[PDB]
Design a protein around this ligand. Structure first.
Ligand SMILES: CS(=O)(=O)N1C[C@H](O)[C@H]2C[C@@H]1CC[C@H]2O
Length: 282
């Protein structure tokens, strides 16, 4: 079926939970043996969210190459994404090592450091220009260059230096700051505006490594971001845009990381975002 009228048909019939459970039943199951090794317990935030072995990102290190991060490669859309958990106190150096090694331009953050009165990720970037951060375990230096605070999101320019080689690179930090503590946003308008700002920066384009996108677990809000982006690109590329099937795209993405889209409300919100976004594109 088309999207916008499939949407009204699920609303009128109140069957979002049943649609979402079908997706959960059909989703891929692949091994995640490296994630579950005892030496990696303090590298995982949640025991039930792990990268698959076949798609995990490897650190360029011989001691321990493990990080909780996955490469989502979308062949028809010609887009790739790295989805990862919010960094932990003992993985902030690994996080920036990955950004460096994978040649990423942008980092997309969809959570606040504290939500619901608890810490959802480490404070992994510097908050003042004159107070830079040094990660001794991976030999990187990170400096805040500039910060632009807007009503729904903040953009930061950061400088990452590889202290071994003295090479430097400019990284863009895109921080969506207004996702509610509970539920999903009422309108997709600010989320779509944010997606378009990430696109306009070059951070999603083939001349750079994959964008790094995270929330707390790296599957819910993060899944919504890449699902909406890929569906909109396919609608632009194809002769028949109504042939794009958001459930089939989501199942394709779940071949590369488990659990993408965590609730039926996030699934409904993803439909809403693609529907509204397809009208603005033209
Ligand atoms: C009722 S439903 O399955 O169609 N679905 C929508 C409804 O508004 C409730 C409960 C469920 C999931 C999200 C929430 O908004």
């Amino acid at each position: 079926m088309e999207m916008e009228k499939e949407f009204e048909q699920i609303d009128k019939s109140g069957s979002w939970a049943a649609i979402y459970q079908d997706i959960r039943h059909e989703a891929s199951d692949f091994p995640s043996r490296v994630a579950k090794l005892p030496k990696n317990k303090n590298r995982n935030r949640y025991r039930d969210v792990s990268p698959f072995d076949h798609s995990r990102i490897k650190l360029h290190q011989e001691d321990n190459d493990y990080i909780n991060a996955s490469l989502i490669k979308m062949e028809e859309a010609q887009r790739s994404y790295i989805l990862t958990q919010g960094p932990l106190p003992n993985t902030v150096g690994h996080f920036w090592e990955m950004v460096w090694e994978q040649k990423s331009r942008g980092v997309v953050m969809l959570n606040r450091v504290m939500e619901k009165g608890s810490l959802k990720c480490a404070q992994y970037w510097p908050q003042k220009e004159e107070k830079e951060m040094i990660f001794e375990d991976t030999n990187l230096k990170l400096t805040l260059i500039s910060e632009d605070i807007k009503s729904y999101y903040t953009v930061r320019q950061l400088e990452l230096e590889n202290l071994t080689t003295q090479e430097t690179r400019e990284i863009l930090h895109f921080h969506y700051t207004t996702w509610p503590d509970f539920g999903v946003p009422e309108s997709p308008a600010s989320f779509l505006n944010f997606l378009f700002k990430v696109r306009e920066s070059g951070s999603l384009s083939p001349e750079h490594g994959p964008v790094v996108v995270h929330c707390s677990a790296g599957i819910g809000r993060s899944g919504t971001f890449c699902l909406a982006d890929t569906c909109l690109l396919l609608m632009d590329k194809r002769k028949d845009p109504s042939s794009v099937d958001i459930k089939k795209v989501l199942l394709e993405m779940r071949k590369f990381r488990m659990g993408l889209i965590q609730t039926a409300d996030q699934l409904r919100f993803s439909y809403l975002a693609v529907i509204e976004g397809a009208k603005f594109i033209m």
